[PDB]
Amino acid sequence: SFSGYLKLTDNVYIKNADIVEEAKKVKPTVVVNAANVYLKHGGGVAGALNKATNNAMQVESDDYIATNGPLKVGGSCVLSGHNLAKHCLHVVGPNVNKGEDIQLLKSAYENFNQHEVLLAPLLSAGIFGADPIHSLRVCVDTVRTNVYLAVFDKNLYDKLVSSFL
Q: How does the record classify its membrane topology?
Protein backbone atom coordinates (compact mmCIF):
# COMPACT_ATOMS: atom_id res chain seq x y z
CA SER A 1 0.00 0.00 0.00
CA PHE A 2 1.04 3.76 0.51
CA SER A 3 4.30 4.37 2.38
CA GLY A 4 6.24 7.35 3.70
CA TYR A 5 3.31 9.77 4.04
CA LEU A 6 3.04 12.39 6.73
CA LYS A 7 -0.41 12.41 8.32
CA LEU A 8 -1.99 15.89 8.26
CA THR A 9 -5.52 15.08 9.46
CA ASP A 10 -7.78 12.03 10.07
CA ASN A 11 -8.03 11.50 6.28
CA VAL A 12 -5.38 13.64 4.54
CA TYR A 13 -1.76 12.40 4.04
CA ILE A 14 1.14 14.08 2.17
CA LYS A 15 4.47 13.01 0.66
CA ASN A 16 7.20 14.67 -1.43
CA ALA A 17 6.90 12.37 -4.45
CA ASP A 18 6.45 12.32 -8.17
CA ILE A 19 2.80 11.19 -8.55
CA VAL A 20 3.76 9.13 -11.68
CA GLU A 21 6.40 7.20 -9.73
CA GLU A 22 4.02 6.87 -6.82
CA ALA A 23 1.24 5.54 -9.08
CA LYS A 24 3.58 2.99 -10.76
CA LYS A 25 4.66 1.74 -7.29
CA VAL A 26 1.28 1.60 -5.56
CA LYS A 27 -1.05 1.12 -8.57
CA PRO A 28 -3.89 2.65 -6.52
CA THR A 29 -7.61 2.19 -7.17
CA VAL A 30 -7.77 5.88 -8.12
CA VAL A 31 -5.16 8.33 -9.30
CA VAL A 32 -6.38 11.95 -9.65
CA ASN A 33 -5.30 13.91 -12.70
CA ALA A 34 -5.03 17.73 -12.62
CA ALA A 35 -7.11 17.98 -15.81
CA ASN A 36 -8.41 20.86 -17.90
CA VAL A 37 -12.01 20.89 -19.34
CA TYR A 38 -10.79 19.58 -22.70
CA LEU A 39 -8.79 16.69 -21.20
CA LYS A 40 -5.76 17.99 -23.15
CA HIS A 41 -2.92 16.52 -21.08
CA GLY A 42 -0.13 18.78 -22.23
CA GLY A 43 1.87 19.80 -19.17
CA GLY A 44 2.13 19.63 -15.39
CA VAL A 45 0.68 16.55 -13.69
CA ALA A 46 -1.57 15.79 -16.72
CA GLY A 47 1.31 15.79 -19.21
CA ALA A 48 3.39 13.59 -16.92
CA LEU A 49 0.56 11.04 -16.24
CA ASN A 50 -0.33 10.93 -19.94
CA LYS A 51 3.33 10.43 -20.98
CA ALA A 52 3.56 7.51 -18.48
CA THR A 53 0.59 5.85 -20.26
CA ASN A 54 2.40 6.15 -23.67
CA ASN A 55 -0.38 8.61 -24.72
CA ALA A 56 -3.15 6.00 -24.10
CA MET A 57 -4.74 8.43 -21.58
CA GLN A 58 -4.91 11.14 -24.28
CA VAL A 59 -6.45 8.80 -26.90
CA GLU A 60 -9.09 7.65 -24.39
CA SER A 61 -9.69 11.28 -23.30
CA ASP A 62 -10.20 12.53 -26.89
CA ASP A 63 -12.82 9.79 -27.45
CA TYR A 64 -14.51 10.87 -24.15
CA ILE A 65 -14.59 14.55 -25.25
CA ALA A 66 -15.83 13.64 -28.76
CA THR A 67 -18.81 11.83 -27.14
CA ASN A 68 -19.54 14.05 -24.13
CA GLY A 69 -18.11 17.49 -24.74
CA PRO A 70 -15.89 19.30 -22.27
CA LEU A 71 -16.02 19.01 -18.51
CA LYS A 72 -17.04 21.98 -16.31
CA VAL A 73 -14.39 23.79 -14.23
CA GLY A 74 -14.88 22.13 -10.80
CA GLY A 75 -16.10 18.93 -12.46
CA SER A 76 -14.67 15.50 -13.09
CA CYS A 77 -14.92 12.27 -14.99
CA VAL A 78 -13.75 8.72 -14.25
CA LEU A 79 -11.67 7.08 -16.97
CA SER A 80 -9.14 4.21 -17.06
CA GLY A 81 -6.00 4.44 -14.94
CA HIS A 82 -4.10 2.49 -17.66
CA ASN A 83 -0.74 1.28 -16.26
CA LEU A 84 -0.92 3.75 -13.32
CA ALA A 85 -4.08 2.84 -11.43
CA LYS A 86 -7.45 1.02 -11.83
CA HIS A 87 -9.11 4.40 -12.57
CA CYS A 88 -8.08 7.95 -13.24
CA LEU A 89 -10.35 10.61 -11.78
CA HIS A 90 -9.79 13.63 -14.08
CA VAL A 91 -10.61 16.64 -11.91
CA VAL A 92 -10.71 20.22 -13.22
CA GLY A 93 -9.56 22.78 -10.69
CA PRO A 94 -9.82 26.49 -11.63
CA ASN A 95 -6.82 27.75 -13.56
CA VAL A 96 -6.08 31.15 -12.00
CA ASN A 97 -3.70 31.79 -14.96
CA LYS A 98 -6.80 31.66 -17.24
CA GLY A 99 -8.93 33.93 -14.95
CA GLU A 100 -11.10 31.08 -13.52
CA ASP A 101 -12.87 31.53 -10.19
CA ILE A 102 -10.72 30.26 -7.25
CA GLN A 103 -14.05 29.58 -5.40
CA LEU A 104 -14.48 26.56 -7.78
CA LEU A 105 -11.53 24.85 -6.05
CA LYS A 106 -13.84 23.58 -3.28
CA SER A 107 -16.24 22.14 -5.93
CA ALA A 108 -13.26 20.46 -7.61
CA TYR A 109 -12.18 18.81 -4.31
CA GLU A 110 -15.77 17.60 -3.66
CA ASN A 111 -15.29 15.13 -6.53
CA PHE A 112 -12.77 13.26 -4.30
CA ASN A 113 -15.61 12.37 -1.86
CA GLN A 114 -17.05 9.88 -4.37
CA HIS A 115 -13.92 7.65 -3.89
CA GLU A 116 -12.91 5.93 -0.62
CA VAL A 117 -9.17 6.35 -1.25
CA LEU A 118 -7.23 8.38 -3.81
CA LEU A 119 -3.64 9.24 -4.79
CA ALA A 120 -3.79 12.94 -5.82
CA PRO A 121 -1.94 16.12 -6.56
CA LEU A 122 -2.87 19.51 -5.01
CA LEU A 123 -5.61 20.89 -7.25
CA SER A 124 -5.01 24.20 -9.04
CA ALA A 125 -1.38 24.26 -7.83
CA GLY A 126 1.67 24.44 -10.18
CA ILE A 127 0.90 25.67 -13.67
CA PHE A 128 -2.76 26.23 -12.64
CA GLY A 129 -1.53 29.28 -10.71
CA ALA A 130 -3.31 29.01 -7.35
CA ASP A 131 -1.51 29.30 -3.97
CA PRO A 132 -0.71 25.67 -2.98
CA ILE A 133 -1.06 26.55 0.74
CA HIS A 134 -4.67 27.65 -0.01
CA SER A 135 -5.22 24.44 -2.08
CA LEU A 136 -4.09 22.23 0.82
CA ARG A 137 -6.40 24.09 3.26
CA VAL A 138 -9.38 23.64 0.87
CA CYS A 139 -8.41 19.97 0.47
CA VAL A 140 -8.38 19.20 4.23
CA ASP A 141 -11.64 21.24 4.77
CA THR A 142 -13.50 19.59 1.83
CA VAL A 143 -12.31 16.02 1.31
CA ARG A 144 -13.68 13.46 3.81
CA THR A 145 -12.34 10.33 2.06
CA ASN A 146 -8.70 9.10 2.37
CA VAL A 147 -6.50 11.31 0.17
CA TYR A 148 -2.76 10.67 -0.30
CA LEU A 149 -1.25 13.86 -1.70
CA ALA A 150 1.92 13.68 -3.79
CA VAL A 151 3.80 17.05 -3.92
CA PHE A 152 6.56 16.90 -6.52
CA ASP A 153 8.50 20.00 -5.44
CA LYS A 154 10.61 19.33 -2.21
CA ASN A 155 10.81 23.02 -1.34
CA LEU A 156 7.02 23.41 -1.73
CA TYR A 157 6.45 20.18 0.29
CA ASP A 158 8.56 21.62 3.17
CA LYS A 159 6.70 24.94 3.03
CA LEU A 160 3.28 23.16 3.02
CA VAL A 161 4.13 20.96 6.03
CA SER A 162 5.82 23.73 8.06
CA SER A 163 2.91 26.18 7.48
CA PHE A 164 0.05 23.65 7.99
CA LEU A 165 -2.31 24.84 10.68
A: Multi-pass membrane protein
Q: Taking a C-beta distance cutoff of 8 angstroms, is the pair 107, 135 a contact? A: no
Per 3-state DSSP, the chain is made up of helix, strand and coil in percentages (nearest 5) of 40, 20, 40
CA–CA dist 149, 73 (Å, integer): 21
Provide the terminal-to-terminal Cα distance of the chain, rounded to the nearest Å. 27
Could you give the number of structural domains in the chain?
1
Question: Dmax over Cα atoms in the chain, in whole Å?
Answer: 45
Q: In what order do the strands lie in the sheet with 12-16?
A: 6-7, 12-16, 146-151, 117-120, 30-35, 87-92, 76-80
